[PDB]
Each structure stands twice: as C-alpha cells, then as structure tokens.
Symmetry: D2
Subunit: 457 residues, 4 copies
Amino acid sequence: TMKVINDPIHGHIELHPLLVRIIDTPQFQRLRYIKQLGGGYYVFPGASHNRFEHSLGVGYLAGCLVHALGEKQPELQISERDVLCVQIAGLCHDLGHGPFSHMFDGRFIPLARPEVKWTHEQGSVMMFEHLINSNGIKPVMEQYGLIPEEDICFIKEQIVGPLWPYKGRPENKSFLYEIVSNKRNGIDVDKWDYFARDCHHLGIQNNFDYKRFIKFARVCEVDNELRICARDKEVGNLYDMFHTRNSLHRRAYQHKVGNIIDTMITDAFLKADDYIEITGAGGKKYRISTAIDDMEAYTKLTDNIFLEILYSTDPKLKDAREILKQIEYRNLFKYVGETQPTGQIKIKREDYESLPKEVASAKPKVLLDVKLKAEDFIVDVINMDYGMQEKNPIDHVSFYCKTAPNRAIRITKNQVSQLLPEKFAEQLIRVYCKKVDRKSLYAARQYFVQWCADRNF
Amino acid sequence: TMKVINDPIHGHIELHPLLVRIIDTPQFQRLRYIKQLGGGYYVFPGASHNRFEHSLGVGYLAGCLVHALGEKQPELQISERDVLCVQIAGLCHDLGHGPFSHMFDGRFIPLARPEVKWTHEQGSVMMFEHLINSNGIKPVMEQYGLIPEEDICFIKEQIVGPLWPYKGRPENKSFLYEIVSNKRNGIDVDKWDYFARDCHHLGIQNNFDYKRFIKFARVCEVDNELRICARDKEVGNLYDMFHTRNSLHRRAYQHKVGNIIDTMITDAFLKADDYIEITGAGGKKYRISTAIDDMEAYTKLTDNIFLEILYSTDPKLKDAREILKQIEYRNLFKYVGETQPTGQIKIKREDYESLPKEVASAKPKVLLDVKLKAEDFIVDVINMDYGMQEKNPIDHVSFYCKTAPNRAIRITKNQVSQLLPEKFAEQLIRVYCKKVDRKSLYAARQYFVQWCADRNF
Amino acid sequence: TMKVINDPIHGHIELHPLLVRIIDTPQFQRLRYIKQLGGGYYVFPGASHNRFEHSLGVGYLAGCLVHALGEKQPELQISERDVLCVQIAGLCHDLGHGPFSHMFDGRFIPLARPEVKWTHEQGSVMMFEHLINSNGIKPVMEQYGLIPEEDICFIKEQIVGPWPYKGRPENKSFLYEIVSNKRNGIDVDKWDYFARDCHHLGIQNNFDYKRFIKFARVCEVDNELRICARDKEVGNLYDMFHTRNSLHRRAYQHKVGNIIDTMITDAFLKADDYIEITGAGGKKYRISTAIDDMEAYTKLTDNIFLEILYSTDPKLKDAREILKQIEYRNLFKYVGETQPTGQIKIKREDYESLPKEVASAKPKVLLDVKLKAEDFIVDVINMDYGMQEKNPIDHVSFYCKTAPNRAIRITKNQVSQLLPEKFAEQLIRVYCKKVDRKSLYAARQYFVQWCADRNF
Amino acid sequence: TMKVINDPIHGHIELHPLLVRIIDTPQFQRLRYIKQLGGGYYVFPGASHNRFEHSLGVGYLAGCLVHALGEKQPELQISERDVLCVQIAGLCHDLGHGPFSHMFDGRFIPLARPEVKWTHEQGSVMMFEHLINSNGIKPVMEQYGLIPEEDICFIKEQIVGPLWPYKGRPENKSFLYEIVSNKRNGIDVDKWDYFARDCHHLGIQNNFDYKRFIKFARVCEVDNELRICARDKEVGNLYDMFHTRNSLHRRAYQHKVGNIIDTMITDAFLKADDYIEITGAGGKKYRISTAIDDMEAYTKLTDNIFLEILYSTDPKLKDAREILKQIEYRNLFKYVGETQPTGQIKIKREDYESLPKEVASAKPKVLLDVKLKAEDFIVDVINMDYGMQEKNPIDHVSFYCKTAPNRAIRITKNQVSQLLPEKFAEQLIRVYCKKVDRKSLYAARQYFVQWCADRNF
Ligand SMILES: Nc1nc2c(ncn2[C@@H]2O[C@H](COP(=O)(O)OP(=O)(O)OP(=O)(O)O)[C@@H](O)[C@H]2O)c(=O)[nH]1
Ligand SMILES: Nc1nc2c(ncn2[C@@H]2O[C@H](COP(=O)(O)OP(=O)(O)OP(=O)(O)O)[C@@H](O)[C@H]2O)c(=O)[nH]1
Ligand SMILES: Nc1nc2c(ncn2[C@@H]2O[C@H](COP(=O)(O)OP(=O)(O)OP(=O)(O)O)[C@@H](O)[C@H]2O)c(=O)[nH]1
Ligand SMILES: Nc1nc2c(ncn2[C@@H]2O[C@H](COP(=O)(O)OP(=O)(O)OP(=O)(O)O)[C@@H](O)[C@H]2O)c(=O)[nH]1
Ligand SMILES: Nc1ncnc2c1ncn2[C@H]1C[C@H](O)[C@@H](COP(=O)(O)OP(=O)(O)OP(=O)(O)O)O1
Ligand SMILES: Nc1ncnc2c1ncn2[C@H]1C[C@H](O)[C@@H](COP(=O)(O)OP(=O)(O)OP(=O)(O)O)O1
Ligand SMILES: Nc1ccn([C@H]2C[C@H](O)[C@@H](COP(=O)(O)OP(=O)(O)OP(=O)(O)O)O2)c(=O)n1
Ligand SMILES: [Fe+3]
Ligand SMILES: [Fe+3]
Ligand SMILES: [Fe+3]
Ligand SMILES: [Fe+3]
Ligand SMILES: [Mg+2]
C-alpha cells in the first residue's frame, strides 16, 4: 500500500496511503496541465514541467524536514498526526493556480476584473475545501488517525496564514507553521524545491544546498515562542541563497522576450473573454474572468484555453486568433529601451495605466514626421527585492552557538562582511513598441529618450 | 542573423538563419504540444518533455558529426550545402507524429483503418512538403545556396528511404545517408539523443558516450560503398550501447501500467471517433482517422483532443468521457498474468483478433460461480529485440586498424568475448482484463494457466 | 563529539564519537598516502583519490543499510551496539593495504617471498589488533555499551571469515553479509567502488543502490535469516554485474597500467635488501619482511617510490634507472594477446615457464639479433563475475509481493533469453623488456609461432 | 600523432606532439606530487587532486579560446604558430610551485628568507628555461615550425609579464597577452579551470558558465590597440563570477582549520630546516630555503619532504617530528575569536611579526589564572577582495553593442543595478592559541577581548 514514485530531482518518494487517496482526484490531477513557467517556455525550450511534481517534491521536503526536527529533538512531542498534516498542507499548497501559473493572477485578473483582489492562495484554500467535501475524504481521515475538526483548520492556516492568532495548534507548536510557507523571513521548503527543479530543467547551475541547512537546524525559545533556529556560521549561506534567488529572477523569470510573450497572451485572453463559455455547478455558464467564483467551472480551467482559441473557427474570435498566429510567427512586440534602475520614485499599481500617455505626450526637441499615439506603447514595471520590501530578511532570523545550543542571538549586517549590497529593493521600467517598421522604432526611441530626460530618470 | 538557443542536454546551440526561418512556422511549432513518450508521463512524473527539443538536438548532433567527419578527412569534399541539407533533414525527421507519439500509429491507426499501411515517416515527408510549399522557403534556399530541385529530394531520401536507388547525391557521397537514420545496423544520432534526453528526464543512468565515438569515427571504403567505420577498441562501447538501449526499453517503454494506460486512451479515442470534427482545406470536415489524408486538418491534431473529450458536455461522447474519468481516478484495468518467454511462439501480424478469445475458451474441471465472457480482453505482443529483425547488428559494423586506417575489416562476435548474449531477440505476450470484479479476477487466473500451461503457447 | 564530513560522492556524513576517536590514530591516517588505483593514475589523470574517503564511505553505507533494515522490520531486535559494530567493521576493513594497494599483494609478495601465502585481509586484522591495543580504545569501547571480548571477535569475523561464527548467535546471521559477502558479492564495497570510480575516472555508472536498499527484506531460507531481494528487480542485478565487468575491462585491466605496475614491481624487487625500515626495538626490516611487524608496516607507504626515485646512493642505481625510464614514458613494448580458446587454463605454477616457450620457438627466418627468455614478461588476466563460472545470483533468495515472509528462488531462464552464457574467461598478454625498434618485427614472428604451436 | 587523454572535467582533449614531448620530462612530471589545495586536504577529504590535470586543462582551455576567437574573426591573421605558443604558455604556467602550493610562497619563504622577494611565476620562468635547455627541445621546435628566439621570449612574457613594453609580438597582436594571464582585469582561463576543478572535487556546485562567455567574445580596437570585449548584456554574469570567486575563497580557501594546519606545517618546516640536505648541480648541498637558487635542487623538492620529516629517525629532527605527530593525532592549535571586518585601516605585511607581542601586552582589568607570554599566541591576517586592491575590475572591461559590433563602450556600476557591493576589499584578524587546557583558553580569550576593546573599533 506504501506506494513509491520516482522523481528526477529527489530519489524515491515514499507515499502514505492517505496521500495516495488524496492525489487520485480530478482536482489534483488538474495540475498536470498547468505549466511552471508560462511565457518562459518559448525562450527556454527545456522548461516544460508542470506543478504536479513540484507539489510532490514540496510535500516530500516538508516531511523530511519535520522528520529530521523530530528525530534530533525528542522533547518537542511530535506525532504522526502532525507529520501527516504538514505533508498534506505541503502537497496542496498550489491547487489555486490558473492558466500559465503567475500570469493569470498577475496580468490578466487585474486587467479584466479590477474590482476584486484575488491571489492564488485563496484559490488553493477554496479548491482544497471543494476537494475534501466532494471526494469523501473525511472518513479516511478518521480512519488513519486525523481529527478533521481541527486538522482541516490547521491545513488551511498553513497555506494562507491566520484568518498568536492561530487556532489549529497551540502556542508551543509554532515551529510547525514555518515549514511550507514562512511569513517572517521567507525561508521554506518551497523555495528549495523550485530552486532545484528550475535549475535542473532550465540548464542553469544552482548554488544553495538545503541538506546542510537541515543538518544544522534547531528549535529555540525565541520571545516565549518556539521557532526554527540556524547555526550562527551559516549567515553567508543565507546571503548566497538570496543572491541565487535574485540571479534566477534576473536571468530567467524576468526575461524581456518572455515578459512580452506573456503580455501578448494576456491581450489575446482579454480579447477572447466574452465568447468562451464554461459550465459550472447546476448547469450555470461562466467566463474566464468569472470562473474564479465557482470551483466546478474552475476545475476545467487549464492551459487548454490557449489551443481552444488558437484552433477555433468562430468568427467572433478572429482578433485573438490573429494575435496567437503572430505569436507563432515570432512577430513579437519590439523592445525600445529600459530606464536605468529608478533614481528615486516608486510607481504604484494604479499608475501603470497612465505611463503610455506620458510617453506619447512627450515632445522631442527635434521634430519627427512620424506620429505615435498612446495606444501603441507598452510600459512594463519590474520589481526586484529580497521578498520584504526594502527590509533585510536576515534581520528576522535567529542563530545559536555551539557552546550554548539552547540560546538564540541576532547577527547584524556589519558583523558578516563589507562586500554586501547596501539596498534590498529596485525598480526597472521597460518600454515596448507595437509598430515594427524602422521609422516607427526610431520615432519610439526618440520619444523614449525625451520622456526619460523629462522625468529626470 | 545567427541565433543561440540554450539546451539542458547539449548546451548552447548555434542556428543558421535558414534553420530559424524553417523553425518559425506552425507546422514545426505544433511539436510543442506532442509529448515524447505519451502514456509514460502517468507512470514517470518527469517525462513531460516534447519533440521540439528532440528535433533541435538531432539536428545539432547531425551537424556536429558532419563537421567532424569533414574536418578529419579533407578529401571527402564536404561542402556547406551538404551540411545544411543534413541539418535540415535531421531537424524535420519526427515532423509527422500525431497525438501521444507512437501510441497513434502503433495502436489507433491499425485498429481503426486496417486496410491502409501508414507510418509516421511518410507523414513526415508529406508535412515537410506542405511546410515548404505553404510558406515560401524555396527563394530563401536559393539565396543561401541550396538548389531545391535536388536538395529537397536529398532531404526526402534521408527521411523515408530509397523510395544505386538514391538520386540526390552520386555514389561518391554514399556515407551521407547513414547519419539521420541508419537501416543497415541502426547507429545514428537519433538513438544518441533519445538515450541522453530520456535518461536525463526519467532519472535513469546511461553509460554510452557519443563524443568518444565521434573522436574515433572514420570513413572506410567498403567495396564500392563509402561507409562510416568505428575503431577496433570500440566493440565494448558498441555492446554497452546496445545493452543500454535494451535496458532503457525494458525499464521504461514496456512498463506494466504505461501500456494499459495507452490501451485505455486508445479505446477512449476509438469510442469518441465519428463525433469529433476537424476542419480541413476548403471548408471540408474530417475525423481523427481520416485526418491523415489532409495535411491542413492534420496540422490541428495534437494532444488537445484528450482534454477536448475530457471536458466535453455533448451526450454523444459519454463513453469516452467515462473512460477518461476512470483514467483520472486511477481505476485502471487489472493485470491477468505474465505469459513468460515460453519458446517457439512467434505471433505475427496476422494474429490480431482471435488471441483474446482463446483465454476463456478453456474448460477446466472446476465449478466457478461466476462465468467469464470472452468479449472483454486486450492482448498485445511486445517485440523485444535489437531492432535488426532478430539478428546481431555487430556483423554490419565496419572497423579499421592503425596500420591500415583506410582499409575496412570485420570483427565477429567470437573474437570479442564469450559473455555476449546467445540470442538477440524474444517475444512476450501480455493479456489484460477489462473487467475488474474480484470474483472475475480469480476466474481469469484459472482460465489463464489453462491456456498457457496446458496448451504450451 | 558528533562531527560532520562533506564527501563528493555522498552527502554530509555523521560520525559517532567512537568512530572519531578511532579515526584520529596514526594507523588510520596512514591510509591517506596509498593510491586507490595504484598505477592507473599514470593513465587516467583524474584517478588520484585515496583509501581514506573509501573507508569513510563504506562505513557510512554499512550504517545506512543496517539502519534501513532495522527500520523496516521492528521484530529483528537490532540495537545500537550492532549498528556501531557494523560501522566499525566497515570503517577498518582496508587497513592492510601496502604501496599501490592491490599491486603489492598481487605482484610483489608472490615474487619476493614465494613460500608465504599472504592476503591483505590478514594484514587488516593485524592492523586492527595493533591499533586497538596501542591506542587505548577498549575503555572507550566499554563506555558505549560494547563488550570488547565478543565485539572485537565479531568485527574480526566481519572483516575476514572463520556454525563457525562465534561473535553473534545464529539468528543474527543477516549481519554477516553486509560489509563483505564471500557468497555472491552483493555488499557495500562494490557500491562504493562503482560510485567513486565512476565519479573520478570520468565514466558513467549504471547501478542505483538506493532502489536496492529500498526493496530489501529479511526472508528466512533454510532456517537462516538472510537479506532478500524483490522478484521483479533481477534485471537490476544483471545490469550491476555487466557494469562491474565493463568497469574492470575499461579501467582495471588497461595495458599501460599493467605494464607500469610491472615496472614498479621490478624496481621494488631490484631495490630490495638495501632499503631499511625500522621496527619495534630498533630492528630493521626489508620491504618484503616488514609484513611481519605492524609497527614497521605502518611506515610503509608510497613514499618508497619517491625515496628510490630521489636517492643519491650508488647501491640503488638500477631501480633509479628503471623509475627514470618510467618518467620518460619509455615503457615496455606490447606484441599481442591471445583469444579465449582451448578450454585449458594457465595457473600460477606456469607463470615462469611461459616466457621460455616463445623464445624456444623456431621462426621460419633466422634473426640476426638473438632473443633470450630472461627478458620476457607474460601476464594472464582473469575476467569473471566473481565466481568460478558459477552463476552469482543463484544463492540469493527473492520474495513476492503477495507473500513477503516466504522465499522463492528464481532461475536464469525465467528472467529472459538476453543474458550472458558464461561467468569466467581468461586473457594472456606478453611484454618484452627490450624496446629496441629492431626487435619489433622479430618479436611478432616469435609470438605468432608460439600460439600456433600450442594450438591457439 | 595527436595523443588523446581523458579528463573528469572536460572531455577527451587532444595534444600536439610538441606538447607530448614537453610533458614527458622530469620537470613537468614533478607536478604529480604537488597538491592543489595543500592544507585543505585535511578538511575536505575529496580534495586530493594535483597540478598536473590543472595545467593540462588550462592549456586545453587556452587553445580552445584562441581557436574560437580566430574562427569568429578571420581578419585577425591568427596562425598555427601563435595558437601553439599560447598552448605551450598555458601548459607551463605553474612549473614553479613548491610543496603544498601556496603554503610555500605565502608562509615559508617570507619567513625563512625575509630579505628576498620571490613569486612562483619567476620560478615557473626559470623552470621553463631549465626544461627547454636540459631536454633539447629547441631542434624539435625548429622542426615543427616555431622560431625559438622570438617564441621563447613570447612565452616568458605571457607567463610572468613584460619584464610598448612587450617584445615577443607586435602591437596589432596585443589580444594574445591577456588570455592565459590577464593583468588589466582578472579574467583568464586559469580561473575558468580551477573554479570547475575545485567545485567538482570539493563537493560544491559552480555558478559560472565559461562557454556562454566564449560564445559572446570579440576583438575590439580600444585605445589604438586590439583587446577582448564581452557583450553589453553580460555584465551581471561577470559580477556573479567575481561573487563566485569570493564565495569559494570564503568557504574553502580561508577555513580556520586549514589555515592553522598550514601554520603548523610551516613551523615544522622551519624547525626541520638546517638539517635537510638536497643535492643540486655539481654535488652541492642545498637547504629547503636556499634551494630556489638552483633548479636541479628544486626539481626534487616536493611533498615527499613532509613524509621524510615524519618518518625520520635522527635525533636532530625530533622537534619537527613531534609537531607532525601532534598534527596526526588531531591536537591542533586552539581558537580565540575574530575581528569585525572593516576598512578605513589596514595592517601592512611589515607588522605581521609584531601583532602577537601587542596581544600578549594587553592588560585585562581582572587578574587571570595564568600569565601568557608572546609565544603562546598566533595572529593571522586575511585579505579578501575582488583581485585589484579596492579597485573595481569591471571598470576595466570593455563591451560592445549588437547594432554596432566594432565599437567599444564602457558601463558604470550605476547602469547595472542598485544591489551591488559598495566596497571591494576588506580585512580580518584571527587569533589562535598554542595551549589546549581550559585555563589557558580562558586567559587567552580574556586577553584578546581586552586587546580588541583597547583600540576602539
Ligand atoms: N497512484 C498513483 N501512482 C502514480 C501516479 N503517478 C505516477 N505513479 C506511479 O506509477 C506506479 C503505478 O502504480 P499504479 O498505477 O497504482 O499501478 P499498480 O501498482 O498495478 O496498482 P496497485 O497494485 O493497486 O498498487 C506507482 O507505483 C507510482 O509510483 C499517480 O498519479 N497516482
Ligand atoms: N527565433 C526563435 N527563438 C527562440 C525560439 N525558442 C526559443 N528561442 C530563444 O528566444 C530568444 C528570442 O529570440 P527572438 O525571437 O529573435 O527575439 P529578440 O530578443 O527580439 O531577438 P531579435 O529578433 O533578433 O531582435 C532567442 O535568442 C532564442 O534563443 C524559437 O522557436 N524561435
Ligand atoms: N577529526 C577529524 N576531522 C576531519 C578529518 N577530515 C576532515 N575533517 C573535518 O574537518 C573538521 C575540523 O574539525 P576538528 O579537526 O575537530 O577541529 P575543530 O573545528 O576545532 O573542532 P573541535 O576541536 O571539536 O571544536 C571536522 O568537522 C571534520 O568534519 C579527520 O581526519 N579527522
Ligand atoms: N604520454 C603520456 N600519456 C599519458 C599521460 N598521462 C596519461 N596518459 C594517457 O595514457 C595513454 C598511454 O599513452 P602512451 O604512454 O604513449 O602509450 P602508447 O599509446 O602505447 O604509446 P605509443 O605506442 O607510442 O602510441 C595515452 O593515450 C594518454 O591518453 C602522460 O603523462 N604522458
Ligand atoms: N543567463 C543565461 N544563462 C544561460 N542561458 C541563458 C541565459 N540568458 C538567456 N539564456 C538562453 C535563453 C535562450 O535559450 C537563449 C537566448 O539568449 P539571450 O541572450 O537571452 O538572447 P536574446 O533573446 O536576449 O537576444 P539578443 O541577443 O538579440 O538580445 O539563451
Ligand atoms: N560552506 C561549506 N559548504 C560545504 N561543505 C563545507 C562548508 N564548510 C565546511 N564544509 C565541510 C568541511 C568539512 O569536511 C565539514 C565540516 O565543516 P564545518 O562545519 O565548518 O566544521 P568545523 O569543525 O570547522 O566547525 P564547527 O566545529 O564550528 O562545527 O564540512
Ligand atoms: N590559502 C589558500 C588556499 C587556496 N588557494 C589556492 C586554491 C586555488 O587552486 C589556487 C589558485 O591558484 P593561483 O593563486 O596561483 O591562481 P591565480 O594566480 O590566477 O590567482 P588569482 O585568480 O587570485 O589571480 O589558490 C589560495 O589562494 N590560498
Ligand atoms: Fe510553490
Ligand atoms: Fe527522432
Ligand atoms: Fe574496501
Ligand atoms: Fe594555474
Ligand atoms: Mg511564499
């Protein structure tokens, strides 16, 4: 009954029967058709993996971490119930992802439904609830030892945080809330998992080594609240981990061609929004933007919509079809130029829609015969940080010393090295053009340099 | 202009502008949605790679081999025209596959159109002709130095076969037809790419090294036939290559669960046929089985059909929908038994329908409460061999000595070692029980040994 | 003192304080200066690893396998003392190697003291005895629940063989085939060899011992508990044996490595009775005689090679000339090998008589330069699956998923017809000291005459 | 006769017969008994590699880079003679290393003979001249195509430096002087080789990718002389390369235990001096410290001296033998504490011998149990920078743009990112103790804390 599955990254993953029963559901098997990198597959031809193996690996890593922590410290009183709950929470932490992963919740939803705030963790929680109530998993849960009344709440809290504001587990079990997702300093098994998987698949070498971190992990009584500590001689390792994350974002996740491909795919989805019907619960009909209201219709919302629009013949989908055909001919939107890392100004989300008008309104000192409108400019804003919005993540980590392994201390930046970056946040503004002839590109470059000079960038 | 594509297997790759022109067409871009294995993805969760990178790697390897051969021996008169032709041929060799790769032409087409002999190489030739004719590539070929009226014929001969039978090149360049596909002994870059990619993705280890083979490769003048000859010390490497191929096939390609999943998918496709329509050229309508006769309809035929049937709501497609739902719940068909390599049994193409019937035709002297019917079975025969029609390909490999490297000699199996296999092929028979009832499972057990042990087949 | 060691092959290796105490001894640190492949470093530049990491990895793998076995079946009653003893036995299983490892006991001792039958496992047992007696480890052993009388005998029986075993009772018989398996050869030493050699040499491995460890049980056979394998993983074992044969043929039996080992052995033989090694009580021992004293054997490593190479004394001239000829790559020439035929096997006693046969042969055309049998070296290489033509996986017991507690042996025909047809072979190689270009044609004519004369 | 050798790092690398004859020399085979890391072998058990493979790989990499640069631009007039000279220069760039590599020329010679300044590049030049003269390579060089009079000077200049300053080649071939060893910036194939080798042997995973850098390399015309420029989009890769160098240094090359072991070995060597006799030319006897005055005595100075001292029997070498025995039982010098890395002040090499006196001269307020003399302390100074002593190496690198490839530009640190280090150099001080008992450790820590607080960090 103890199934074994072979993963290209890890070794052989040992699966509990309850996890096997949970996995064999349509809701979880939906993840087989949602790619890990939406627009990045058309730049790296090796990044064709999905979130299925990602969730499997995250669950495996959570189980390994909790097992090691329990083994090295027998007074924490960790039972099989807690291990099963942690593995279940780590297995179903990305059930709410939509088509093309982060594109759906970062580019399409704000542009189609700006009156709703929706992240993928909310969708994950609702999808997990739907799966549990639909597939009849509770009697198995009491069969195998779990108590659904508080275990469901614990698993829900492990994903979206509080909704000591927690209710699943008491105060002396706080170290169980910082495994799958950490809300304090952003160190978790999810980061390690996708670091390893993306580095293996893209063709880019990794730097971080999580096994050494697990070997030197401990639980301290920091501010009358138990939490995971780290050995004080691995501060440079954490800094290198964050540098590796920054390098991955710089090289692969924020590629210009991939970003513009995501933009064109989102444009096609927006143009093909009012002509796609999805059957919901009770025979109701939904839309692409409205499908995040009913899970019975959101279950069948995957990357198949791209080929549905591309292979269609309906006369009402002509524009989106043409956009996709231009995508497949590499008639991409041209790239004009990027502003230097912003001197000092922060652009909020609501200011994104006014930038093309500002770019087009700028009058060059030299008159241009060609004229351009605000509709033919794509302005993109990129944010780079350490996950804490100008804060130092290492300032929230606790370290211990070998002489007294029961005490936690804090380490400042000045005590590590002088070769560290001064700032922890950045912004980058990118401008693209729709017109492709050389004269329009030259005019767009003149407009861009004039606008950059005018706003003092 | 020159382009560079990163590959997790072969590293950075250089691309001629003509290759970039050929790549950016819908006929080539449809390979992004056809999987390399098919049903193995539901057994190995890391086998999600497609044929796009496969074609890229095969073309790259063919170019490298041609370059090395031309460099080492300058008297062979290898020009850039031949290198471009070989790279084009290797890039468009798997252009004619359909949904789920070998599942389509292996199971669905023979089981739905028994009166037509169809293989994916002829489909690849037709697709290449359509791609050339529908995109205007001949002027580009003439611009870059390729005479289409001979080079297209040369590429087609490299793809499908002879159709001195060859007419693309004179008999002097008789070694250029054994690079992309070899029909004499089976040594070609296609297998090298297969091994490297599949072992990287699945998690299996291979010991073959094609770089060493490239280093020691040479062109030997066998009687009136220039051929590629290995070196005398490479016999062990060749035997290791064939052993690795056999182990790969046994471990991955003929798994117990992958084959039955492929059979269930084929059954769902057969049930769903005549209710799925694909628009061809001129507004005509086609089906899945008839799509192969029109290239325009065949272009829009990929793995999208699986999700098209799965998410459908028409009452006409209830049976296929239920079969796919059973796939999604991991309620697969049960395994009856392993018929073993009994002996002289050499079931040929003619035996295709009556084999399943004679498993319940036995009349043992046992009283069974439940009676098992003969209309529900699946029986398949696996061809475990070296790919040389139950023969040793080592006798088809030339060699050369240091003293006389321009003279070809042959080394037999005896001179290598006595630990080589005595027989190079065998046949296995696998039978499947569509019914899943527990009582019928025991009934199928008794009716299995009676057909196998007593009838010694 | 729980320490952590980072290894290129495995991950971070944990060490019990007893293992750390045993490691920090001159006898164990002596292993840092003995080459794993010996003379193979002069053909493969990447083969520079030593026995220290090999011993550490073998101990780690033995501990891992014991822990897995104890975790899977809670009814075997495996305690911490047993796993500690297995780890110790796996750690100190190669303490007896000499200069260039296998070369010493394969070529030097038979040719230096033919009357002594000596293997390196006996040397390992003697070195373990010396280390334990000299470094005061017995109180430390007692401090962790180990009884020296029984447990030291158990470790010795694990290292070298003897129901003949006395360290443990007969119901713990599954603890005697982990570190070393004389029966069929399924142990952790071959796993470590495969992994480390494939990583360092530059060759790709095919075996995966983690899957094997995952599918290991203890199923009783003939009233004897044994480690059992799954019925559907026999192809993995066949691939393992094929990988072992390929690795041996590719690396361990290279012509240049063998001739370099032959030259080194000749230099050592010619340089004997001049080199003095100090022993207990101020005694002096030779290179061959130092195997009778462990304190003198401790100071015998690959340093002798450089001592002879850099020597200035006039008594060691010939060995220095041989080493210099090695340094200029003026190695002995290779004429040609035979092929497996005749069903006759050349044994040890025929080693010296073989060179005279080729010299005594009469070529068709007389040679101006005469050839003597005192300058011929002939080597015979045996290739097999670790057995004497016997099937290796015939004594291993399998099990079925339906009934795990019961063992069903599997034959060779049930697996497939794509399997080898033999489990033993032989090869014969001839080397000539005289590397002059004049004798290249003369040597070949003499060689081809001998094979036909002896019906090859 | 192009010999082929197998490297665990690279593939099968070919060697010219001239390189074959140069390698088969005692002066080159001496490198088989010199370690790459020296004292780091006792902390990382897998780091047992020597300089032989490193030299072979550096030669191979230099040859490959020259070949690629010549193929990209056929107008550089690169001939086979220049490629061969660069390969020879790369092969023999480390012939002057002493025992334990860097330990010798970093600790022993500055302490054994303080009145002479020596570097292993001068030793490499002397060894190359000795090899060429003793082995009679000049007629071989004349036969193959090299002119010894100019090529020997060219190789010597490539190895050590200018000694327009250069004379081996004219000013229009100036790009060949920065390949093996680059003085303008720290970018050369030496780093590209030992990065990969040390990563492969230490168990750490590399980050840099030299093949991509070689892809985007071009020859410019900067300051009226040809140079080598990267591409403007590859600046972050260079920053990551320097970060990787710093990380490797911090993690491995400056380990506390390795440094203390090197210090103990240096002390043992200093004590063993004046008792070891090495025979040079003419029967003269040379000490360890004065053996650098004759290459015949230096050829026999390898790691064998360590085991010669350890296995000695004479009563003269009792002290060094006792020190080595203390090392072998793992009774090392203890540890006290660090100092906070901070610039604005530096400790010159002249003050290295006075710091322990200052530490022992501190006056703790509370009387200690035992009084410690100046010989009971060890003080170590670590200089960690980017290789240019507070300068920015990227400020000396030239770049070129895709639109105009022949124009060289410069890029400022502000144009790259705001998450880069502000400084490029730092210093640390490490204090050790020569006693092991607890009271001495406590007293040493008190004295060190008082001294650290005395000078007001
Ligand atoms: N259950 C399950 N197994 C999977 C899945 N994906 C890959 N596998 C692997 O595929 C193998 C095949 O298992 P099954 O499909 O259940 O076939 P089976 O072993 O004959 O079925 P059982 O005898 O009931 O265990 C398993 O051992 C898994 O490791 C999945 O989504 N669900
Ligand atoms: N052309 C092309 N590039 C691909 C493809 N798949 C991945 N790539 C990579 O994606 C990168 C984007 O290339 P381009 O389509 O030319 O986009 P670009 O950055 O605007 O480059 P230019 O067209 O020259 O201006 C290329 O460098 C390729 O390495 C593909 O199918 N076609
Ligand atoms: N003891 C020991 N450690 C080794 C050896 N080889 C590598 N190491 C590693 O090197 C590290 C150095 O540790 P130690 O030699 O004990 O010195 P240390 O850092 O002061 O440790 P403590 O003295 O216990 O505080 C260890 O953690 C080991 O992981 C070896 O042969 N013996
Ligand atoms: N020459 C030489 N080869 C080495 C060295 N180290 C490893 N090798 C490898 O060992 C192999 C043996 O080469 P040789 O010693 O010349 O033996 P050989 O090939 O029989 O010599 P020839 O018959 O003259 O070709 C070579 O192919 C090299 O790849 C070395 O230091 N010098
Ligand atoms: N840092 C990187 N490391 C490895 N591969 C990379 C890296 N960045 C991009 N690649 C891969 C992605 C693609 O397969 C390929 C394209 O190279 P890239 O330099 O991104 O071209 P590009 O699209 O920016 O074109 P252009 O040269 O016109 O700017 O290289
Ligand atoms: N950053 C690193 N990454 C990988 N391996 C490392 C690293 N640092 C050290 N190692 C290796 C070197 C040794 O083989 C082993 C032990 O190192 P380390 O943890 O530093 O021990 P130590 O004895 O110096 O420290 P401590 O006693 O404070 O734990 O791990
Ligand atoms: N304390 C130590 C230990 C490690 N290294 C060693 C490890 C590397 O293998 C070697 C690098 O060799 P070189 O310093 O001779 O190479 P470069 O001359 O190019 O130095 P750099 O790259 O800093 O310019 O130094 C070191 O610098 N000193
Ligand atoms: Fe995630
Ligand atoms: Fe193919
Ligand atoms: Fe061993
Ligand atoms: Fe170097
Ligand atoms: Mg998070």
